[PDB]
Write a protein that binds this DNA or RNA. Structure first.
Ligand SMILES: [Cl-]
Ligand SMILES: [Cl-]
Ligand SMILES: [K+]
Ligand SMILES: [K+]
Ligand SMILES: [Mn+2]
Ligand SMILES: [Mn+2]
Ligand SMILES: [Mn+2]
Ligand SMILES: [Mn+2]
Ligand SMILES: [Mn+2]
Ligand SMILES: [Mn+2]
Ligand SMILES: [Mn+2]
Ligand SMILES: [Mn+2]
Ligand SMILES: [Mn+2]
Ligand SMILES: [Mn+2]
Ligand SMILES: [Mn+2]
Ligand SMILES: [Mn+2]
Ligand SMILES: [Mn+2]
Ligand SMILES: [Mn+2]
Ligand SMILES: [Mn+2]
Ligand SMILES: [Mn+2]
Ligand SMILES: [Mn+2]
Ligand SMILES: [Mn+2]
Ligand SMILES: [Mn+2]
Ligand SMILES: [Mn+2]
Ligand SMILES: [Mn+2]
Ligand SMILES: [Mn+2]
Ligand SMILES: [Mn+2]
Ligand SMILES: [Mn+2]
Ligand SMILES: [Mn+2]
Ligand SMILES: [Mn+2]
Ligand SMILES: [Mn+2]
Ligand SMILES: [Mn+2]
Ligand SMILES: [Mn+2]
Ligand SMILES: [Mn+2]
Ligand SMILES: [Mn+2]
Ligand SMILES: [Mn+2]
Ligand SMILES: [Mn+2]
Lengths: 97, 98, 114, 87, 97, 81, 111, 96
DNA sequence: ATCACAATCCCGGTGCCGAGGCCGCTCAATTGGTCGTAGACAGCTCTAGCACCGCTTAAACGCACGTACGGATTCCGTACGTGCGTTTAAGCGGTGCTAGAGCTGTCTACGACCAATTGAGCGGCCTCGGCACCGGGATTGTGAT
DNA sequence: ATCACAATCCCGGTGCCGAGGCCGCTCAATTGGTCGTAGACAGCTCTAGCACCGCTTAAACGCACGTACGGAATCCGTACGTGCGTTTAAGCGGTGCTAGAGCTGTCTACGACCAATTGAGCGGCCTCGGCACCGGGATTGTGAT
């Protein structure tokens, strides 16, 4: 027989799981929910980022559109922590040219 | 004989069902209702088994949620008994109904 | 003039989530004509942060339920007991989640015993 | 082509106890006798609405098989986003 | 001499305000609230006057709608008088909390 | 900018109630209504100001408010967009 | 028929819609038929509300449609009210509507 | 002098107003509401067509994505009439 | 309070199947390089946002007074919850059939990209008719009697 | 019933200014040509949806019975609507100041695109440890007394 390659975020969700709870697993259904969750928030932030660019007559989605999209979409503390992780990752990456 | 006072078994049932996550409508009846309704829109539809399970998970969560709002409408009126007028108010305020 | 020891954009960013993947999904998504280099890094980092947050609380729910594996019920308990995750996912149904134990006070039986 | 039997009155397979169970999960202690037919009616409207959108996706894709994804996309349209079937 | 019975004027006021489209909050106290609230998120902000008018249109239409739902919660309890518990139930069911 | 919430007067709230079909009003509604209004305005203005900052402006536009209302499921017609 | 509108039998601007569809981050490609169908749909919905809105104007002895007429037209039409259920019409007000239990008792007997 | 170009559906709203109520006019604010409406429905229909193409791995939005979008977004009779006017307008354009 | 007794809770034993690890092949992310253009930036204009003040007056305010409303109380009838024995059909595990999902390879109609052309639609300017606002004085609606 | 009297209606008058038309400049739509690949279309494999069937049970069902519920009916106290005289400040308008929005032009850093490259992540394949299920004791609450 053959295959049919379907991408999911499963390996990254496992890696992150291993970091926070090193002796915990996850059922395929729970992983299904985490995959739903990642796809959902992705679409929300990119969607909002698209509009932000369009509203401001800009051709390009930058980290700054992502940042503004995050403050609009996430509540309170979640937004603060999300922006720090975002800012830290972009600062680190731009040094690692 | 032994006889529970009315409300005692109802309260046990709330504790048991709020503790579990299992689908509460029997599956075969749910699947025939899905096929009858779908048929009336288009004939000769097949369903993935998982398509019927997605509809059953969505329908059950919608009704469990509605019954919460409905309960709050009953209690607002100083009742303990949900009535169709409670469902109608919750649906009206939800924007499901004119 | 040897070029490569392959270095993931994820490793450059210090992330588990795939910067490569996320850039490609942003270029294929018809979101804008162009996607900057930082966009996929920031976005991948925000998806990692929120994943860590849900898995932290879900792991704890599993451990409370005397289980080593996270099931959807653990994700629902985590999400619905957290004010901000609950608001973020207010319009989302978790299949096989069930609900929080919650009985309106008036429905409880009258004062008995001592 | 055998043709499956005719489907009639299947709304009644949403029984009084199944509706009690749902109400119990929803925190309900006491239930008027008219609640059962009102619930059936509310459920029919919800199912018709989601199935209509889902079959519209199925038609658009030139299939005769309603996928989980057509239901998931139909639920999202209706502001009833469902996780766990290919979200 | 003579006086209208309680509720007779209130009916007339309903007929009057449901016939008309005019904004019912004095514009200048509304403008001060908007500025006061804005300052907590960002100091030394200006507003297009049409920006404040958009906010006034959106707030009064929301409150009118909320008052319709509140009224139905009051009547549901066999009352003709709206109370805070009526606003709270309408907002809980609207999913505003 | 001291206590401008009380600028929303008992009678102004009573007018809004009237347009919403309300015949009789408890004395506690006025403070309840003020709380609800502040929460509504805080939520819409936070988002509007956020669009302002992203546009690197210092002036809140109608359009900032219209995008804010759209995000909150409170779409407004008549102010552009 | 130089203009795509005239070719389509449309008042609404097919060329403009085609441009907005292309510039709008919707797909890599836009078929020729798409902006014709969409322009047509937009005209039809515009006609439908301007028809009910014009009626409201005449009913109120006015020559000119104002927002109130648009609000009366939309909220009194089942389908338009459902389409625009999430929308506020600036300066629209609301439909006259008093709940039966709020009305006085009709004097109720004689005189 | 000379303000920056600000595009609107105003001329087309008036052309349709004159087909339907030739003796009727329209306030500036009412034209603003009608513009908001066209922009709103444009957004919704194009948005659905976008998702539809993507769910089906298509790079192109055809009139077929617009029709399905319209069936998902418009209630009953509005949809029947909207499909009819849309199909009629493509047909008559494909011929001329 | 002080019981018997249901129903739930908790425990370790049982055995089963899906979580999770390996493995090897492949598609997609990476490296490196070229080319053109979006937007950051710097400069300049004049819009419209803001401050401030005086007058006019309608709206807000607060206080008196009394009605009709909400809430507490008492009651009575039967709609519901509980539990019994009987009836019903879901669920399960099984085989048996093929429809249609979904993948590949082919290959041209169709939509992107482009240059050159011109008329549809935009802002500027102007005015006059629709409608807001008024008061004359008409009939209706509310409440006192 | 009668009888204010405030509200409501309709009227023609009147004076304001924005709807809507005319003009003429311009940029975005159209025309006609190129060129590349998206997707129709046909063919092929085989996953998974559907259908039939016979048990075994647990759930669904109808019915007896009663009690706690909901709703009807009454009474009492004051919250809240109405109307007044008094105070407040919104709205108006007109003047006077400058922030900064919104536009321009310049130049280059940055992201699209292309080729060559290789290992991250895929499905296939396998297994054994987590947990669903069980039966059997302890423990917890209810209802009787
Ligand atoms: Cl960037
Ligand atoms: Cl097309
Ligand atoms: K300005
Ligand atoms: K299949
Ligand atoms: Mn940890
Ligand atoms: Mn155990
Ligand atoms: Mn296996
Ligand atoms: Mn696996
Ligand atoms: Mn390997
Ligand atoms: Mn790689
Ligand atoms: Mn490079
Ligand atoms: Mn530029
Ligand atoms: Mn009463
Ligand atoms: Mn089976
Ligand atoms: Mn076949
Ligand atoms: Mn096929
Ligand atoms: Mn062509
Ligand atoms: Mn013009
Ligand atoms: Mn007069
Ligand atoms: Mn008259
Ligand atoms: Mn007149
Ligand atoms: Mn004009
Ligand atoms: Mn001309
Ligand atoms: Mn042209
Ligand atoms: Mn292809
Ligand atoms: Mn029997
Ligand atoms: Mn009672
Ligand atoms: Mn004035
Ligand atoms: Mn002024
Ligand atoms: Mn300056
Ligand atoms: Mn500037
Ligand atoms: Mn630069
Ligand atoms: Mn794998
Ligand atoms: Mn293993
Ligand atoms: Mn073992
Ligand atoms: Mn098992
Ligand atoms: Mn057991």
């Amino acid at each position: 027989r053959k295959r049919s390659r379907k991408e999911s975020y499963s390996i990254y969700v496992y890696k992150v799981l291993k970091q926070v709870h090193p002796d915990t697993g996850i059922s395929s259904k729970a992983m299904g929910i985490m995959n739903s969750f990642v796809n959902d928030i992705f679409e929300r932030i990119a969607g909002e980022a698209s509009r932000l660019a369009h509203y401001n007559k800009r051709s390009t989605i930058t980290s700054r559109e992502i940042q503004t999209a995050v403050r609009l979409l996430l509540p309170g503390e979640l937004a603060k922590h999300a922006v720090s992780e975002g800012t830290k990752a972009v600062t680190k990456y731009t040094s690692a040219k | 004989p032994h006889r529970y006072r009315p409300g005692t078994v109802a309260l046990r049932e709330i504790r048991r069902y709020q503790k579990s996550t299992e689908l509460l409508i029997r599956k075969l009846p749910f699947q025939r209702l899905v096929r009858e309704i779908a048929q009336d829109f288009k004939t000769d539809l097949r369903f993935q088994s998982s398509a019927v399970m997605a509809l059953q998970e969505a329908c059950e969560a919608y009704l469990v949620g509605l019954f919460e709002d409905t309960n709050l409408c009953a209690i607002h009126a100083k009742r303990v008994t949900i009535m169709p007028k409670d469902i109608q108010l919750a649906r009206r305020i939800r924007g499901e109904r004119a | 003039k040897a070029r490569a020891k392959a270095k993931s954009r994820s490793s450059r960013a210090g992330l588990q989530f795939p910067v490569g993947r996320v850039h490609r999904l942003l270029r294929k998504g018809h979101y804008a004509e162009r996607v900057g280099a930082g966009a996929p890094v920031y976005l991948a980092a925000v998806l990692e942060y929120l994943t860590a947050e849900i898995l932290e609380l879900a792991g704890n729910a599993a451990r409370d339920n005397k289980k080593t594996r996270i099931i959807p019920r653990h994700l629902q308990l985590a999400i619905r007991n957290d004010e901000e995750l609950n608001k973020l996912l207010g319009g989302v149904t978790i299949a096989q989640g069930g609900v929080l134990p919650n009985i309106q006070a008036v429905l409880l039986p009258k004062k008995t015993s001592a | 082509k055998r043709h499956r039997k005719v489907l009639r009155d299947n709304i009644q397979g949403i029984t009084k106890p199944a509706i009690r169970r749902l109400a119990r999960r929803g925190g309900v202690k006491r239930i008027s006798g008219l609640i059962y037919e009102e619930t059936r009616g509310v459920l029919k409207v919800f199912l018709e609405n989601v199935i209509r959108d889902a079959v519209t996706y199925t038609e658009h894709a030139k299939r005769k098989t309603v996928t989980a994804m057509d239901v998931v996309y139909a639920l999202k349209r209706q502001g009833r986003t469902l996780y766990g079937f290919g979200g």
